[PDB]
Amino acid sequence: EVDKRREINNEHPLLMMPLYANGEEFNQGKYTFWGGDTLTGKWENIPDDLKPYTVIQLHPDDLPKRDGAARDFYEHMLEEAAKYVNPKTGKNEPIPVILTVYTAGNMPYYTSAHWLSTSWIDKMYQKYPNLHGIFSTASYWIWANDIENKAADYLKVSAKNGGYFIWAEQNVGSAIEKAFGKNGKIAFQKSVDKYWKNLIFMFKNTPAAEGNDSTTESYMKGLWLSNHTYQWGGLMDTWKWYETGKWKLFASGNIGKSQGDRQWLTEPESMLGEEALGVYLNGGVVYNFEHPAYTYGVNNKESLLFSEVIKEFFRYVIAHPAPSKEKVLEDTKVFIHGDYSNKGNGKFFVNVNTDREQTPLYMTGRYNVIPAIPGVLKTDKLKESVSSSRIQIKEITSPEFSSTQARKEYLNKLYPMNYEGDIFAQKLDNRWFVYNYKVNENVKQTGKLKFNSLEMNVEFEPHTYGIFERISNGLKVNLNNFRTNKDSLWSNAQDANQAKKLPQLTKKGAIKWIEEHYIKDTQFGEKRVTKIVLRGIDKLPTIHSLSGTNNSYDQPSLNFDQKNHMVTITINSNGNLEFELHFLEH
Numbered sequence: 001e002v003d004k005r006r007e008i009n010n011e012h013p014l015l016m017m018p019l020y021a022n023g024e025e026f027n028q029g030k031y032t033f034w035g036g037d038t039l040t041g042k043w044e045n046i047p048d049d050l051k052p053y054t055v056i057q058l059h060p061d062d063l064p065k066r067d068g069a070a071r072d073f074y075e076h077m078l079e080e081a082a083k084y085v086n087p088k089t090g091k092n093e094p095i096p097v098i099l100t101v102y103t104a105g106n107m108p109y110y111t112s113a114h115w116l117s118t119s120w121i122d123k124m125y126q127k128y129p130n131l132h133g134i135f136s137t138a139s140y141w142i143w144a145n146d147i148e149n150k151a152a153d154y155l156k157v158s159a160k161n162g163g164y165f166i167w168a169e170q171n172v173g174s175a176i177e178k179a180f181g182k183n184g185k186i187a188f189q190k191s192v193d194k195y196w197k198n199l200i201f202m203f204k205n206t207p208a209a210e211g212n213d214s215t216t217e218s219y220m221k222g223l224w225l226s227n228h229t230y231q232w233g234g235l236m237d238t239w240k241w242y243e244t245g246k247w248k249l250f251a252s253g254n255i256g257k258s259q260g261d262r263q264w265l266t267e268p269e270s271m272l273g274e275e276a277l278g279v280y281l282n283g284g285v286v287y288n289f290e291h292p293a294y295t296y297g298v299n300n301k302e303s304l305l306f307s308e309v310i311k312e313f314f315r316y317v318i319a320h321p322a323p324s325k326e327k328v329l330e331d332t333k334v335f336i337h338g339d340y341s342n343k344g345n346g347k348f349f350v351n352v353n354t355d356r357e358q359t360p361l362y363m364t365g366r367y368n369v370i371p372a373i374p375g376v377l378k379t380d381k382l383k384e385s386v387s388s389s390r391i392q393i394k395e396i397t398s399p400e401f402s403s404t405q406a407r408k409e410y411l412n413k414l415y416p417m418n419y420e421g422d423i424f425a426q427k428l429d430n431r432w433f434v435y436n437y438k439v440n441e442n443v444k445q446t447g448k449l450k451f452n453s454l455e456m457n458v459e460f461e462p463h464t465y466g467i468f469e470r471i472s473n474g475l476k477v478n479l480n481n482f483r484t485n486k487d488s489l490w491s492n493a494q495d496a497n498q499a500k501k502l503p504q505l506t507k508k509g510a511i512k513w514i515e516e517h518y519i520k521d522t523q524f525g526e527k528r529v530t531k532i533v534l535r536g537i538d539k540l541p542t543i544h545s546l547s548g549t550n551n552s553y554d555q556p557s558l559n560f561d562q563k564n565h566m567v568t569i570t571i572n573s574n575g576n577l578e579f580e581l582h583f584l585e586h
C-alpha cells in the first residue's frame, strides 16, 4: 500500500468542486470553464476552513471529440493548480485536483475523455502530487463493452499512486450489479478485492424518472459496510426536475423533458440539503452536485444555494463527523444480499420508507437506509467484522421481502417506531434530524420527537430541514428552509401545455440568468412559519447565538405557558438559521 495522497472519511469528508471545460472557447484557443469560474479564482474563493476538505474536479464537458484535446486542457490546468502561489503567505500551495477520466462509456461520439489513456493518467499522478484522484461518472445509460475492465485499470492506477478512484453511478439497467460482476464481467470485482481502500463509490441521482434513488443509495451504503469501497457518497443533481418533467413550483401538470434549462434551476435550494442528509445520516462522506452554475455559482462567486445551504451543511458534517463504519454497523439490524433489478428497483422501498417512485427523499427515518450489496458479491468481509454479529443478513428473495406489506412487517419487528407524525425524522445520539418530505406539493407536516422525557413537536412547510440537539443547558437548533422564488422563469405560461412551448432558455441563457437575476437582484421567497413546541420545561427559555441568512428571518417569538410547563416557538424565515435555547426540564 502506497501512502494515500489525502484522507477521506467521516472526520475528513470531501466536497467536490466541479469545473466544466468550455469546448467552444477551447476551439478559439482559450482555456476556460462554463460559467466563468477560473481554477485559481475558484480555489481562492473557497473559505479557508473548507479548503482542507474540498477538491477541484475538472470535467471535460464539450471539449472537441478527438485525440489530444482533453490532455491539452487538463495538462494546462494541472500546471495552474501546481504552480498556485498563496498571495497572503507568498508560498507555493498546489491546488488539490481530481480529473474526470471516464463518462458516457467514454464513447468517442460522446466525450473527449475517450482519448485519456491509463498510461497518461499514471504519468499525471507521478508528475502532480496535487492530483488526488480520478473520476468516472454517468455511464449507466451507455454501459460500454469494457467498462468493468477499464474501471479495474482506473482503480489499480490510483492505488499504485496512492490516489482515489471515484465512481458515481446509478442503478439504472443494473449498472451497480454489473459493475461488480453480475453478468460475468468480473475484472472490477477482482480489482476491488485488492484495492478497495482506494475506491470511492457514489450515487448519481440524475436519472430521476427511473426511480432508483433508494436502491442505489442502499447499495452505496452496503458496499461501504462490507468493505467493497473505502467510503461512499452521492452526486445530487438539480436536473432531476427536468427528468421528471416538473415546472413551476407546486404547479399542476407535467411538461416532460421540454425545458431543460428552466427546469434545472427550479429545485428548491433547501431540498439539496434534504438529499445530502441521506448521505450524512448513513455514514456517507463524499458530496458533489450538478448543475454546477446553480449548485455552486459562476464567475468565482458562490450561488445562494451554495452559500446558504451546501456550505453550511458541509460545515455541519465537518463539525459533527458522520457516524463511523463501526457505529453504522452496530445499529444495522438488516442487511440485504441480492439484486434490486429483480425486485422492482425503486418500487422495493415505496410505502416502506419512500412516498413515491420518483423522489430523492425519505418519508421515515425508522429503518434509516437499509444497506444492500448485489447478489454477485459475498458477505465474507462483512461477517469478519466484530460489530456485525447481531445483523440479520438476508437474501433479497427471502419471503420477508416478497411484498410491500411483508417488508414493513419484517422491518418493524427489528426497527422500533421511535417518533410520531407523518414527516421524516431520524435520531443520532442526542440529535433529531427532521425534514418535510414533500417534493412538489404544498403540504405542511408535523411530528412529535422526544429527548427522554422532553417532548418536541414541530410543524414544517415543504423544503424545510432541522437539526435539534439536546445539549446540557438546553437545545441547539439548526434550521434551513431557504427557497427563492423561481416563478419568473415560468412567466407567460399559465399551464403545463403552455410551459412546454416557452422559448428555450438554453445553457448560455441560464448561465446569464444566474449572473443577472440570481447572483444579484435575487427574487427571494416569502418568509414562512415554522413551529417548535417544547413540553416539560421549567421556565421561559432564553435564546442565544442567533444567526442566519442576512435579512431572512424575523426575531423568533417564544410563548411560555407556566401552567402546562411548555413553550411555543414561532419562527418566520426563509434561509439558514441557528440558535440555542437555554432551559431546564420541569
Ligand SMILES: CC(=O)N[C@@H]1[C@@H](O[C@@H]2O[C@H](CO)[C@H](O)[C@H](O[C@H]3O[C@H](CO)[C@H](O)[C@H](O)[C@H]3NC(C)=O)[C@H]2O[C@@H]2O[C@@H](C)[C@@H](O)[C@@H](O)[C@@H]2O)[C@H](O)[C@@H](CO)O[C@H]1O
Binding pocket: 020, 034, 059, 061, 062, 103, 104, 137, 138, 141, 206, 207, 239, 240, 242, 243, 290, 291, 292, 507
Ligand atoms: C442520463 C441522463 O439523465 N441524461 C443523459 C446526459 O447526462 C446528463 O443529463 C442531464 C439531463 O438530465 C444533462 O443533459 C447533463 O448535461 C448538461 O448539464 C451539464 C452540467 O450539469 C453540462 O452543462 C453539460 O454540457 C450539459 N449537457 C447538455 C447541454 O447536453 C448530463 O450530464 C453530463 O453528461 C454526463 C454523461 C456526465 O458526463 C455529467 O458529468 C455531465 O454533467 C448525457 O450527457 C446525454 C448525452 O447525450 O444523454 C442523456 O441521456
